[PDB]
């Protein structure tokens, strides 16, 4: 930022890009290293009523996996089915489709 205008014009022409507009050395645009003290918010469960833990525990909502067929416990015309609907094709970008 302390460069003279002659070298500034020389580095701008030889690069082809405006380098003084986007300098890669931070000078004064950054935040101050000392900051005001913050005040972080509390979560949704920080309340004194209607906050029973048995209603908001997903950890004990995990069940053992459902057995579809079993060789031991069970001792064993419909459509052909696919594990998911087929992937829709990606659309070409409207911003910049080609470099």
């Amino acid at each position: 930022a302390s460069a003279t205008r002659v070298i500034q014009k020389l580095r701008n022409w030889a690069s082809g890009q405006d380098l003084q507009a986007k300098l890669q050395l931070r000078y004064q645009e950054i935040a101050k290293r000392t900051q005001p003290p913050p005040k972080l918010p509390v979560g949704p469960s920080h309340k004194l009523s209607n906050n029973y833990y048995c209603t908001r525990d997903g950890r004990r909502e995990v069940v053992p996996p459902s057995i579809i067929m079993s060789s031991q416990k069970a001792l064993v015309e419909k459509k052909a089915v696919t594990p998911a609907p087929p992937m829709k094709r990606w659309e070409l970008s409207k911003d910049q489709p080609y470099l």
């Binding site: 580095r11 080609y98 470099l99």
Partner: protein, 178 residues
């Protein structure tokens, strides 16, 4: 969505001006000359080199450096020998033994940190209930022998006494997030 990085759209045909431009590009090395010019621009820029050790790289109050044992404002050591840091230490770099002190308080007779085994992760300083063990921002403590990098309770307390001037200030500046 997606985009092509190398697939060109259709063809640019063949024109006499385009052929002359491609011939000039191949013969007179135009992209090589512009690469030279950009490196010349870097030559005429300002270097990003700081003057170590007279200039130091910027840091933050959260920085995890050399370990330290803090004290209360009365001067009593904050550690209460609860071994929570040793339990949480992922590298098992903390060894603690303790007994009741002469006045009946539970203070460590042995708080060793193998700093060659430490991974400098801050789990101890975020698990300590009394802010006893901390990571002061000293990183300039490289040694010449492996032995003197194995820290005991006296070294850790002495380092906490040494670095208390900025450790308390950093904890004041950052403690409201944690």
């Amino acid at each position: 969505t997606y985009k092509y990085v190398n697939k060109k759209e259709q063809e640019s045909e063949v024109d006499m001006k385009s052929a002359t431009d491609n011939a000039a590009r191949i013969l007179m090395w135009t992209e090589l000359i512009r690469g030279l010019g950009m490196t010349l621009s870097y030559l005429f820029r300002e270097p990003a080199t700081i003057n170590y050790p007279f200039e130091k790289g910027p840091l933050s109050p959260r920085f995890r450096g050399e370990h330290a044992l803090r004290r209360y404002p009365s001067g009593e050591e904050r550690c209460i020998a609860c071994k929570l840091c040793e339990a949480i230490c992922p590298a098992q770099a903390i060894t603690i033994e303790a007994e009741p002190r002469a006045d009946g308080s539970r203070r460590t007779t042995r708080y060793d940190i193998d700093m060659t085994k430490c991974i400098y992760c801050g789990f101890c300083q975020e698990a300590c209930p009394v802010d006893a063990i901390v990571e002061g921002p000293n990183f300039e403590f490289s040694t010449e022998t492996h032995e003197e990098l194995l820290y005991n309770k006296e070294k850790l307390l002495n380092n906490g006494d040494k670095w208390e001037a900025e450790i308390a200030a950093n904890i004041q500046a950052d403690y409201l997030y944690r």
